[PDB]
Amino acid sequence: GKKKVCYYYDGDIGNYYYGQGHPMKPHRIRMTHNLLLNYGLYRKMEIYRPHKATAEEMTKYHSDEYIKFLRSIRPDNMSEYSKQMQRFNVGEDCPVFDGLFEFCQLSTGGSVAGAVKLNRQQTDMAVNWAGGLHHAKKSEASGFCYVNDIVLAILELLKYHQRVLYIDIDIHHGDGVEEAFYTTDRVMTVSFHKYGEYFPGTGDLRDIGAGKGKYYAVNFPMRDGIDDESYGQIFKPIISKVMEMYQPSAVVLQCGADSLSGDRLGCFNLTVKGHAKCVEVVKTFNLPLLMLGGGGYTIRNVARCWTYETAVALDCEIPNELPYNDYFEYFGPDFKLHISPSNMTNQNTPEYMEKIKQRLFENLRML
Ligand SMILES: CCCC[C@H](NC(=O)C1CN(C)C1)c1ncc(-c2cc3ccccc3nc2OC)[nH]1
Ligand SMILES: [Ca+2]
Ligand SMILES: [Ca+2]
Ligand SMILES: [Zn+2]
């Protein structure tokens, strides 16, 4: 039936700034929040402010040296950490900005707090749009991500769940999450992503895990221009098979919005309805679910996407006419919730989609 939804948000998150021209804009989290408040979605869910995750909570995965560096580095002492910045990959993509550590603590706090709430059986769904920073590694920042809130939230879920399923619909391969759990069967990672001359360069369908984790990493490589029809016809069959074979007791769904049509960095052609169909599909399985954010660089579309996905989590139909809000002008010229796909060519032929699906089904028979 309808599910209890707990949502995490810190009003300060929107003030963190990566720097002039940097595509990652924490302000998109505040736009999302303001839009769903204006649709009246706060009446249907419990809103929590995350705690600031401690260096200690973060070292459940990250190395002590990397976390110590994140806690110490500031724009005023950068010149003294030249060697450490290189070692930890903090620079152009992952800049040093005022309040960087606090931004990581809030992003992480929401995901970990959501996992605790699910473990305690106090909610059916937990949402943290500031989370989903899937590229961060054990001792390295990567692709605008510094602390892997997903890995930390999964480790929390593993205290009470024998098997956890991770699903990643961000346009980028969920490399940091797959790497953390590559050699274990206690977490199955499933990533759908653009593959070929594209960041981070991993996620070939031949990457299936290693040791006890062999067959527990699933990668669906895609080309430019995937649309709602093509994505929908592959997502429900893959997730259904994964649910059937793996039988997880909890799910983490990374909802990176950079897979939408018109994304500044992305080359896909999904609409908000096509992206949200993934949430609807995962919801039908009736398992404890942690919904996270991720990429998304055309901020008006990110706000539309995550507002609609929160409405989906609540089984609440919301009008297409956008209500007035603090960022109303960002949604011009149409002022509608839903988006139209572009006329870009879909390089993912129906035969290619069926062929990759068939190759992945062969691997799933090995469970
Ligand atoms: C989702 C993560 C995407 C990361 C990607 N980075 C890379 O491809 C670099 C090359 N590798 C050594 C990593 C990337 N794509 C675009 C950028 C980018 C970074 C910027 C940093 C400071 C300022 C502007 C930037 N503009 C960018 O793209 C327009 N960075
Ligand atoms: Ca992905
Ligand atoms: Ca695994
Ligand atoms: Zn991404």
Curated annotation (Swiss-Prot):
Chain positions covered by the region annotation Histone deacetylase: 2-315
Details of cofactor binding: Binds 2 Ca(2+) ions per subunit.
Binding site for 1D-myo-inositol 1,4,5,6-tetrakisphosphate: 21, 25, 264
EC number: 3.5.1.98, 3.5.1.-
Residues reported to bind Zn(2+): 170, 172, 258
Post-translational changes noted in the entry: S-nitrosylated by GAPDH. In neurons, S-nitrosylation at Cys-255 and Cys-267 does not affect enzyme activity, but induces HDAC2 release from chromatin. This in turn increases acetylation of histones surrounding neurotrophin-dependent gene promoters and promotes their transcription. In embryonic cortical neurons, S-Nitrosylation regulates dendritic growth and branching.
Cross-link (Glycyl lysine isopeptide (Lys-Gly) (interchain with G-Cter in SUMO2)): 68
Essential cofactor(s): Zn(2+); Ca(2+)
Active site: 135
Residues annotated to bind Ca(2+) 1: 168, 170, 172, 191-192
Protein name, per record: Histone deacetylase 2
UniProt organism field: Homo sapiens (Human)
Annotated gene: HDAC2
